[PDB]
């Protein structure tokens, strides 16, 4: 998602609700540094995903 805090809630609602064993992330097309990887690594790391 374009915004930040909505990305964090969207990860657990859609991904870990399907019993995922690992998550793949990629840099966003826009040239903004460390935007996508921080919300994912803080929610998946809660469960050691």
């Amino acid at each position: 998602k374009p915004n930040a805090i909505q990305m964090a809630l969207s990860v657990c609602e859609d991904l870990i609700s399907s019993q995922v064993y690992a998550i793949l992330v990629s840099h966003p097309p826009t040239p903004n540094d460390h935007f996508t990887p921080t919300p994912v690594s803080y929610t998946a790391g809660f469960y050691r995903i």
Binding site: N3, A4, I5, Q6
Partner: protein, 50 residues
């Protein structure tokens, strides 16, 4: 400042992180209960009472 400079605290509207740097400098001289609660730049106490 003499007033309350509220920032864009709305979480579901926008995002702002540049103004957060000028926030630590206010928390260097906090004292209470005859004890020192001064925070260093990193975030934790510097001279606690262990």
């Amino acid at each position: 400042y003499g007033f309350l400079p509220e920032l864009g605290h709305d979480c579901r509207a926008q995002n702002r992180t540049h103004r957060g740097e000028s926030l630590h400098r206010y928390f260097m001289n906090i004292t209470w209960d005859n004890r020192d609660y001064s925070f260093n730049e990193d975030g934790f106490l510097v001279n606690p009472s262990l």
